[PDB]
């Protein structure tokens, strides 16, 4: 439906959300709204480095449902578009994650 929003306060939060294994980069957005894989979604993303809200016209590539086994948050994994706007978002995330890249810590996805 409408505009999803995701605000990330710090680098651990960004690390949990980022999906480095997605082609072009992806980001996990917690939400109770149910989506289908391949849905196009619009996301307003705030990263820890500033209050600027980054538009992301993305694609649903991952879902976790309500009541998931274990302690997994419900939500959708959104793939970044392959043009310069999406590449810019992915670029900012991986530089913000400098030093967090090789971590073994679990994420919201994989």
């Amino acid at each position: 439906q409408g505009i999803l929003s995701l605000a990330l306060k710090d680098k651990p939060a960004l690390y949990s959300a980022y999906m480095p294994f997605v082609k072009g980069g992806g980001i996990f957005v917690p939400t109770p709204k149910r989506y289908m894989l391949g849905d196009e979604v619009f996301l307003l993303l705030t990263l820890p480095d500033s209050s600027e809200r980054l538009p992301v016209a993305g694609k649903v590539i991952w879902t976790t449902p309500a009541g998931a086994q274990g302690n997994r948050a419900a939500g959708i994994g959104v793939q970044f578009p392959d043009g310069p706007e999406g590449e810019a978002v992915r670029n900012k995330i991986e530089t913000l994650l400098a030093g967090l890249t090789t971590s073994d810590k679990p994420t919201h996805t994989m």
Binding site: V60, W62, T63, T64, A66, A68, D104, P106, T109
Partner: protein, 149 residues
């Protein structure tokens, strides 16, 4: 009374299959003593992706579109081709001590046990629909094969 249940209810909620067909599938699966998800997979009442979406919500499992997965990061080599044929799973990704494995069947557990004892990694299942598993596995195997013999 006779509420449509489980996967059939969700496929109806998702618009994938349709009331009388879902009720029939539930009853026929019961008459045949076949688990409902296996019944739907065998009878091809819906697409594999529609079934995966229903399985994910019904069994509380995450679901991934592996066509969006970066092949160069695949973890296929960690699992013997023997296990891959036996179980029809798609090893996805390794992070730290965890290996995420794509499955199309929400209740297969011996496959996960075999992979855990084979890899000695922590195995975590992720739903991937059955068509995506068979196709993507061979694509990723071609990619891995380019690395050498």
């Amino acid at each position: 009374s006779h509420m449509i249940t489980g996967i059939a209810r969700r496929l109806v909620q998702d618009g994938a299959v349709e009331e009388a067909v879902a009720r029939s599938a539930m009853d026929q699966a019961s008459a045949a003593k076949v688990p409902l998800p296996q019944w739907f997979a065998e009878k091809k009442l819906v697409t594999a992706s529609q079934l995966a979406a229903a399985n994910a919500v019904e069994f509380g499992m995450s679901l991934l579109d592996v066509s969006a997965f970066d092949a160069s990061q695949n973890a296929v080599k960690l699992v013997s081709e023997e296990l891959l044929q036996k179980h029809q799973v798609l090893p996805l990704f390794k992070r730290g001590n965890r290996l995420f494995v794509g499955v199309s069947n929400p209740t297969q557990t011996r496959a996960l046990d075999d992979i855990k004892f084979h890899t000695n990694l922590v195995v975590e299942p992720i739903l991937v629909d059955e068509d995506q598993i068979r196709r993507t596995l061979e694509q990723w195997q071609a990619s891995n094969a380019a690395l050498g013999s």
